[PDB]
Design an enzyme around this catalytic site. Sequence first.
Site, short mmCIF file in Angstrom:
data_model
loop_
_atom_site.label_atom_id
_atom_site.label_comp_id
_atom_site.label_asym_id
_atom_site.label_seq_id
_atom_site.Cartn_x
_atom_site.Cartn_y
_atom_site.Cartn_z
N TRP A 1 9.43 -8.86 -1.96
CA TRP A 1 8.27 -8.82 -1.39
C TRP A 1 8.04 -9.97 -0.72
O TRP A 1 7.57 -10.10 0.60
CB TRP A 1 7.31 -7.69 -1.09
CG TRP A 1 7.67 -6.37 -2.00
CD1 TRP A 1 7.41 -6.07 -3.47
CD2 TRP A 1 8.11 -5.52 -1.34
NE1 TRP A 1 7.42 -4.52 -3.47
CE2 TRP A 1 7.61 -4.14 -2.63
CE3 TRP A 1 8.17 -4.84 -0.02
CZ2 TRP A 1 8.71 -2.91 -2.00
CZ3 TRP A 1 8.73 -4.07 0.52
CH2 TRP A 1 8.48 -2.48 -0.27
N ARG B 1 -0.29 -2.79 -4.16
CA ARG B 1 -1.18 -2.83 -5.27
C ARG B 1 -2.69 -1.68 -4.52
O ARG B 1 -2.68 -1.24 -6.26
CB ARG B 1 -0.32 -3.20 -6.28
CG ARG B 1 1.17 -3.91 -5.74
CD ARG B 1 1.62 -5.53 -6.63
NE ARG B 1 3.06 -5.40 -6.98
CZ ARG B 1 3.16 -4.75 -8.19
NH1 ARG B 1 2.47 -3.81 -8.79
NH2 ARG B 1 3.98 -4.80 -9.18
N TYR C 1 -8.17 -6.93 -1.87
CA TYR C 1 -6.59 -7.35 -1.59
C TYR C 1 -6.88 -7.59 -0.81
O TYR C 1 -7.25 -7.78 -0.02
CB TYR C 1 -6.18 -5.66 -2.14
CG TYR C 1 -4.81 -5.56 -2.78
CD1 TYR C 1 -4.31 -6.23 -3.31
CD2 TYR C 1 -4.26 -4.78 -1.48
CE1 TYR C 1 -2.46 -6.16 -3.20
CE2 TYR C 1 -2.84 -4.57 -2.12
CZ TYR C 1 -2.16 -4.90 -2.71
OH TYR C 1 -0.57 -5.23 -2.53
N1 LIG Z 1 1.79 -7.23 -10.88
C1 LIG Z 1 0.10 -7.42 -10.54
C2 LIG Z 1 0.57 -7.76 -9.51
C3 LIG Z 1 0.24 -9.14 -9.48
C4 LIG Z 1 1.17 -10.03 -7.73
O1 LIG Z 1 1.83 -9.45 -7.63
N2 LIG Z 1 -0.28 -9.97 -6.67
C5 LIG Z 1 0.40 -10.38 -5.30
C6 LIG Z 1 0.01 -8.69 -4.45
S1 LIG Z 1 0.78 -7.59 -4.07
C7 LIG Z 1 -0.86 -11.29 -5.23
O2 LIG Z 1 -1.66 -12.17 -5.80
N3 LIG Z 1 0.06 -12.49 -4.60
C8 LIG Z 1 -0.37 -13.66 -4.25
C9 LIG Z 1 0.06 -15.04 -5.29
O3 LIG Z 1 0.70 -15.00 -6.01
O4 LIG Z 1 -0.32 -15.90 -4.32
C10 LIG Z 1 -0.57 -5.78 -10.64
O5 LIG Z 1 -0.31 -5.13 -10.92
O6 LIG Z 1 -1.92 -6.29 -10.42
#
Ligand SMILES: N[C@@H](CCC(=O)N[C@@H](CS)C(=O)NCC(=O)O)C(=O)O
Lengths: 198, 198
Positions: free
Chosen positions: B103, B13, B7
């Site tokens: 976010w 998360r 992460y």
């Molecule tokens: N709903 C998913 C989260 C998916 C998500 O939006 N993760 C974000 C991090 S908080 C991420 O991967 N963002 C980078 C991207 O989408 O490229 C969970 O609870 O694991």
Amino acid sequence: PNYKLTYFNMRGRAEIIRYIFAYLDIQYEDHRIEQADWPEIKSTLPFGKIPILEVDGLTLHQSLAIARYLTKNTDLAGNTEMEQCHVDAIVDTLDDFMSCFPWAEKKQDVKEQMFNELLTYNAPHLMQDLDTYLGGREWLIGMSVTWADFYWEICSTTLLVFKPDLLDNHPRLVTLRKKVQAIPAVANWIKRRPQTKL
Amino acid sequence: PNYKLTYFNMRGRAEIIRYIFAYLDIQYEDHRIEQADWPEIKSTLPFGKIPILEVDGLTLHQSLAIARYLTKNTDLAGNTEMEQCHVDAIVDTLDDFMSCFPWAEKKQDVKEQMFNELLTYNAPHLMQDLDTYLGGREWLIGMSVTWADFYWEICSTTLLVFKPDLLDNHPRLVTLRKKVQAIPAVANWIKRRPQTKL
Ligand SMILES: N[C@@H](CCC(=O)N[C@@H](CS)C(=O)NCC(=O)O)C(=O)O
Ligand SMILES: N[C@@H](CCC(=O)N[C@@H](CS)C(=O)NCC(=O)O)C(=O)O
Ligand SMILES: [Mg+2]
């Protein structure tokens, strides 16, 4: 046990629960409220949201939490703990995308634009990841149908309302929908359920 | 088993997973990548999102799906199937709310506007619903701590960063946060973890 499902008169977030009840051949009260009674119904909800499922006098909320509860110890759950995790993961990935749409947006002008942008610029990436994930397999998880397949059929049905060519590049995802719609008990529910836009 | 969590360098998360590992006294690799290396890793992921958890080589995704997998058959899950549904429902209600914040919104104008809207109008309503749900009980579900309590602690911590007076009218919700932070294993993690804003 006595079951009472409360939601609006539409497929929406209660449909996954309705599919499960149909598949498992379990009787339940499909309570569909009208907008006029929302103020009264709402004051009884734990967090002001529907659907809720009353089970022998106790209230359960959150559509996916309810769907998971109903499929526990059934063939729709997933064969192993790892697979059950995959089922939950696919459902949440799908639910995450559906939750991006401004369903409550009052201004239709802004709403339509956002729906169109989401379906054109974002949906294709998710559709490709899902298609790649499924590969040449019969179902999304394991060798038999799970409620994850149900959720794909339900979500894609609503997306197709707003983007008819959503799956033109992914015939394997269309075949999956058809297999879900072909399950006897599910086919029966789809044919008899109230016809609503969403 | 061999666990590797990937992460960003923040609670976000992945924190719910980190609390579960700490509580259960499970060793794992806490991999925190750099933004500069995200686009490279993202391309190798089936759905291109983090956190992800590798279990003995096998990759799992979706924070809550992973959390559920890790807590299954442990004292952190509910004591009955119904209570397990309540746990899942509370977590989803909290997650639904936190997911409402933009976010990743680059438009500071729209971002600040939605944050203020969510914190000023919506947050108070949710806090009241949560306080009422909790009532005078020690934990959210049952007579013992569950991962739903962990999630409340994690979610409220981030909310308090933007709205410190969030719980001024809800002492019982403050006490629940404190009860979770007091658990030895959690307290140990809280003091040892990387100090980040989110
Ligand atoms: N709903 C998913 C989260 C998916 C998500 O939006 N993760 C974000 C991090 S908080 C991420 O991967 N963002 C980078 C991207 O989408 O490229 C969970 O609870 O694991
Ligand atoms: N993630 C929740 C969604 C809860 C939700 O937003 N439900 C909508 C109906 S589709 C509702 O109750 N809306 C009332 C409101 O927005 O105040 C679930 O799956 O049950
Ligand atoms: Mg969710």
